[PDB]
Design a protein around this nucleic acid. Structure first.
Ligand SMILES: [Mg+2]
Ligand SMILES: [Mg+2]
Ligand SMILES: [Mg+2]
Ligand SMILES: [Mg+2]
Ligand SMILES: [Mg+2]
Ligand SMILES: [Mg+2]
Ligand SMILES: [Mg+2]
Ligand SMILES: [Mg+2]
Ligand SMILES: [Mg+2]
Lengths: 275, 44
RNA sequence: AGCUGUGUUGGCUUUCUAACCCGCACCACUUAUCGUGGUGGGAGACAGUGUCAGGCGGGCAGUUU
RNA sequence: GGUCCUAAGGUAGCGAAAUUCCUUGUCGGGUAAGUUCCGACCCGCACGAAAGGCGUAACGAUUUGGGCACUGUCUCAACGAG
RNA sequence: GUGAGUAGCGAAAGACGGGUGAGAAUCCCGUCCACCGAUUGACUAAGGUUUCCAGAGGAAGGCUCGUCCGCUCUGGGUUAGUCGGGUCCUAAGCUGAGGCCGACAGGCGUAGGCGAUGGAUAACAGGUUGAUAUUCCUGUACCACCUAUAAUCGUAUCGAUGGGGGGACGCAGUAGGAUAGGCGAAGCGUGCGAUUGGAUUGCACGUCUAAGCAGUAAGGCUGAGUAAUCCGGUACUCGGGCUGAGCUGUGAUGGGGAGAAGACAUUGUGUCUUCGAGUCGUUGAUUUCACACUGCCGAGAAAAGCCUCUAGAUAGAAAAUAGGUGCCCGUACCGCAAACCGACACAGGUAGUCAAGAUGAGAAUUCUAAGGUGAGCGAGCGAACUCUCGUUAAGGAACUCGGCAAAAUGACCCCGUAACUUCGGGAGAAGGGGUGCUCUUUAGGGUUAACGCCCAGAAGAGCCGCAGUGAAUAGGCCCAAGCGACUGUUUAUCAAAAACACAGGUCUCUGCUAAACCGUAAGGUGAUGUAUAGGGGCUGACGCCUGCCCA
RNA sequence: UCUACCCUUGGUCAGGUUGAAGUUCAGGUAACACUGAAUGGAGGACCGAACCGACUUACGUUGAAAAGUGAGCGGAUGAAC
RNA sequence: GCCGUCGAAGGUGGGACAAAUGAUUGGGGUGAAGUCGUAACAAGGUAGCCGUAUCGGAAGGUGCGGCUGGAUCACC
């Protein structure tokens, strides 16, 4: 779980780490790594879009198979490694063709697993097979959205989904945010819940390791004089004085919905969100 | 104190040089006014 | 007040595919995850877009006090 | 307890405070002597619960009052060197 | 012009003898004296572009003078197959054939190119000039290519723009192996004293490179036929060299350096020159030479040279010997500065390599070495007043907006230490004691066969001064409140905070061609991330909590 | 080319000091298993130079310098330069 | 007569325990019940009581568990 710390310093007063007991073979595989230069919000004009980014520690992207091809070949699981680009851990499967690849690792996985559409396809944790071939009440993750595209929905650490039922051409999926939604019946799904479940209790504990992860400070609005934030200065501290708290570009940020009338999402979203 | 001209042979040519004038279009209007006024040195 | 059923007008829906659309899959130009060409699979006369019209709009401008 | 009215019409906790005009509030401690300081009272001109309320070990080239130590800052100045 | 022959003369130790000259406190030569010495010393980048050097100059420039010069006239100075780049490779970025967008101009982008601050990459000692030296010439080398060649092996070979390995990587700590420099005692050369005394007693030095043969203290993994290849995957029964490696040993080397003898010239012109012998042993030993090894989480660039593999091309080349060829650009000079950026010969700023002795944990402090400099105005008199320092009777904040400035505390080794708390802290809490030199005994490592050498701690005895970290360098402390939790960051140049950040709490928005933002659009950021994840609003660790009102 | 964040590739920090997790041995455990002694070398940790800053004060103010020098002062293995 | 070991009292400093005292301050018993309500003992008129929370001027009221030391007809 989480290994705690003892308050020898005011920095390490309440800091709490995440114990690396589910990591085997800590060195990577030197044929599936691709370089990853950073950018802090610097698009193809050099300007600054999205704020609060940049710096920290160098990384190196690790090529992940989200497609789950190579039908009907038994894949062992060798070693469970660490991945900095994302919240889950990672796996190193070996297909019997000697084609070593990476899989995002579900909850308990060391044994050896199968990808096949409908042969028997062996519904267990780690096996990917399309949603027409999955019985109901079955916790899946890493679903595709468009057929043959690649697994998109629910890829986090400790995330999941749930197949509810089967409609006339689609299936019916309950997502992690609590939003029932129709997905086409030939999208794949890994069966299981993705591992590394103790992730959101990692108390960072210090403004320095919240700072070498690629985060910069975020100055509040009411301390900017009114050239650049609609919560401008005033003498002393001040209540906001608007009918609605505003983002730094005029739009009200506290309450107003933002999505627009969109193609192939109104006829599919049955229930909305629950928050 | 550290003054505001720290000289360099490369940034002086990669910015104000001849082939950075002729690069764009408005550089060829700068070079059209310095060989019009009658300057000796067109591009630094 | 309300029945019946033809000649003509304006809708609400429901389904099919021929435009159009895909930051959807292999395939060629090519030992380029750009592009165009090609059988699919999706969505489909809605969306994107042109002209007109109404409503919010200190996000921004011109000025009065 | 009566009664007017408001959409209900200041709860726990703090209180002459970075918040108190009059005010140098008042009684206690500190000094030979204390408009500043510390502990209390509460009649809050006008504290108050995420423009957070009340406490707090550790940390400060922070701000305010009192002790020992040391001294030309001082009573009171004099001499010498570049 | 007046201000006026006034303010200045830009940190800083000079004194004299000799020359030179029309002219000298200032130029050159000599002796003594002082100053830096983790630098005021020695090499290279950036930048400047002849300043460098010899012979002649004295109108201007130099804060004075000048015979002098970084200033004027004449004539000279920079040598590479091996050093730093280019003919080799790729990061961020830039540019982009077709293409996609836009009133025109033009913006974006795929294949391909450009781009070192990085990867690859064959030479080292000594001599010499008035100015250049891994460049010139002395002695030994090495990599690429070409030509003759013999022992020749022959489907033996050459292998891609293509498959594979490889190159290939963070911060932290500790124990090692070897070497560099250091210090002492005993290889050799010269001197042995006219200030009391002394004659194993006084100063100086203790050599050598790259190549190519050897054997090494440690560090890292254990071995076979089958499913664009016999290689790299995969899976199977059976089962002690492999690479990489600082350092050392001979040879390189009958050679070359050397503190000095001794043999030659006019001012020995302050010099060449011919031959001339030493180079042991002991210790203390790094920040140099591995990201090696163990641990930790924040998970630590790419492509080439190089090695194999086949598609293919061909059947022609090992070793060894001998001769031959190898291009372009930068080299002078200053380079923590009188030569660079500050208008100046300006008390500022300017990346990196080398860095010794004494005392010391130490690259701190005081005094010196190698090696440089004496700061381009001086001479007098020692009034007031300003500026930088030193000491003081009795009293000790009475001074004052205020203990503002100064004074005291300061090192190591010991005894001893409260409230309070998040149990880590408070704490160097506070308040206290001891230290010098000489002589006698004994217990402590490592080195070594051992005398020998360095590292140390105990008691006891004794001596001297006013004073024993005797000089320089090095915390004042305590009680009680206020604001902010902390380390951090802010108004280059009147404000460093109680303001900003912060770890944590919430609230709301986003189902993926996501919301949000930049851009008229194409394209991008968000992200090669997907509700334990992203954008925004307020509060600001931790503890106990957050009350009623929806007109 | 100054400064403000920022991307790719490098470099630099004398020394000395406390002693977090763990691991091993011993003591009890066989119940609910926790005390000591060694070893290990953690941290926006403490004292201090280079190095980076600019708190108090005196001088300077037709300055030596259109922002500086003298004595002291804070950070110094990182949110560093 | 001088030197040294041991040595009461004194002076210096941080603590440890009781006691005397102190602006205000919180409950407690005492009376005499004037002030405000009836919470128990009858089924005391909402059956009581023990733990444990949360609210109110005042006894106290409600929630979730246990007890009969719970009338009627003892709640068949
Ligand atoms: Mg306006
Ligand atoms: Mg030294
Ligand atoms: Mg020094
Ligand atoms: Mg103290
Ligand atoms: Mg204290
Ligand atoms: Mg778009
Ligand atoms: Mg500075
Ligand atoms: Mg600053
Ligand atoms: Mg019971």
């Amino acid at each position: 779980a989480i290994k705690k710390y003892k308050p020898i310093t005011n920095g390490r007063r309440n800091m709490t780490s995440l114990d690396f007991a589910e990591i085997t073979k800590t060195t990577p595989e030197k044929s599936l790594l691709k370089p990853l230069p950073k950018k802090a919000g610097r698009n193809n004009q050099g300007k600054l879009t999205v704020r609060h980014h940049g710096g920290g520690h160098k990384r190196q992207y690790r090529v992940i198979d989200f497609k789950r091809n190579k039908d009907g070949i038994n894949a062992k699981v060798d070693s469970i490694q660490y991945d900095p680009n994302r919240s889950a851990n990672i796996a190193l499967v070996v297909y019997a063709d000697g084609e070593k690849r990476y899989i995002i690792a579900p909850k308990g996985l060391e044994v050896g697993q199968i990808v096949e559409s409908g042969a028997e396809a062996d519904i267990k944790v780690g096996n990917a097979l399309p949603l027409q071939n999955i019985p109901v009440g079955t916790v899946v993750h890493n679903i595709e959205l468009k057929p043959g595209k690649g697994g998109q929905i629910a890829r986090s650490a400790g995330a999941s989904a749930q197949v509810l039922g089967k409609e006339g051409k689609y299936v019916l999926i309950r997502l992690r945010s609590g939003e029932v939604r129709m997905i086409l019946s030939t999208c794949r799904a890994t069966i299981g819940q993705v591992g590394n479940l103790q992730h959101e209790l990692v108390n960072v504990g210090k403004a320095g390791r919240s700072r070498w992860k690629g985060i910069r400070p975020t100055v509040r609005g009411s301390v900017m004089n009114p050239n650049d934030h609609p919560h401008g200065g005033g003498e002393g501290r001040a209540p906001i004085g608007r009918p609605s708290p505003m983002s730094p570009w005029g739009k009200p940020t506290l309450g107003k919905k933002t999505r627009r009338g969109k193609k192939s999402s109104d006829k599919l979203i049955v229930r909305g969100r629950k928050k | 104190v550290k003054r505001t001209y720290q000289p360099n042979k490369r940034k002086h040519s990669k910015v104000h040089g001849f082939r950075k004038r002729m690069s764009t279009k408005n550089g060829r209007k700068v070079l059209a006014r310095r060989r019009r006024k009658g300057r000796k040195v067109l591009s630094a």
